[PDB]
Amino acid sequence: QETLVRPKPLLLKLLKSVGAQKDTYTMKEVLFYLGQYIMTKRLYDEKQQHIVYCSNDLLGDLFGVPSFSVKEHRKIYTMIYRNLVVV
Ligand SMILES: COc1ccc(C2=N[C@@H](c3ccc(Cl)cc3)[C@@H](c3ccc(Cl)cc3)N2C(=O)N2CCNC(=O)C2)c(OC(C)C)c1
């Protein structure tokens, strides 16, 4: 009974690029897959792994900043919610 969401096109493209196959997800699944996108594309700092640099990537278009820490929860949840609809 978790809320189901339907990502908008750019978010869906990111999710499918890391092997998600569906069109509707829970918020925890969206977060998991975005994390995997960062990990697979090596967008994090090797020393302080919470730090992401996304300026030269579509992820930067999603979050609207060139860099962020994964501790920026308000920004991360807000930008994900701007990029989906509830089902
Ligand atoms: C010490 O290094 C860490 C510690 C925590 C995270 C993290 N933290 C998790 C997280 C972060 C923010 C929210 Cl709002 C929810 C979950 C989740 C995540 C989910 C979405 C995004 Cl956009 C980024 C990361 N997320 C992860 O995706 N992790 C967990 C740890 N290792 C991983 O391989 C993947 C982390 O993420 C990297 C991808 C940058 C690195």
Experimental technique, in short, is X-ray
31 lines ligand 1 (CB under 6 A): yes
Q: Which residues pair with 84 in a beta bridge?
A: 7
User: In this structure, which residue's CA is closest to atom 29 in ligand 1?
Assistant: 35
Range of the domain at 38: 1-87
Give the 3-state secondary structure of residue 68: strand
| 20, 1 contact by CB (below 8 A) | no
Q: Which residue out of 40, 70, 81 has the highest number of ligand 1 atoms within 8 Å of its CB and is therefore the one to mutate?
A: 70
User: In this structure, which residue's CA is closest to atom 38 in ligand 1?
Assistant: 35
CA distance 46 to 2: 34
The length of the chain is 87
Contacts of 10 (CB under 8 A, 6+ apart): 58, 61, 62, 83
User: In this structure, which residue's CA is closest to atom 39 in ligand 1?
Assistant: 50
Per-residue buried b or exposed e for 46-56, using 16+ beta carbons within 10 Å of the residue's own CB: eeeeeebbbee
Domain count, the chain: 1
| 59, 75 contact by CB (below 8 A) | no
Residue 73: Cβ within 10 Å count: 9
* Phi then psi dihedrals of residue 76, to 5 deg: -60, -50
Q: What is the CATH number of the domain that holds 50?
A: 1.10.245.10
Q: Which residue has the tokens 């994090």?
A: 44
| CA-closest candidate to residue 15, choices 55, 51, 62 | 62
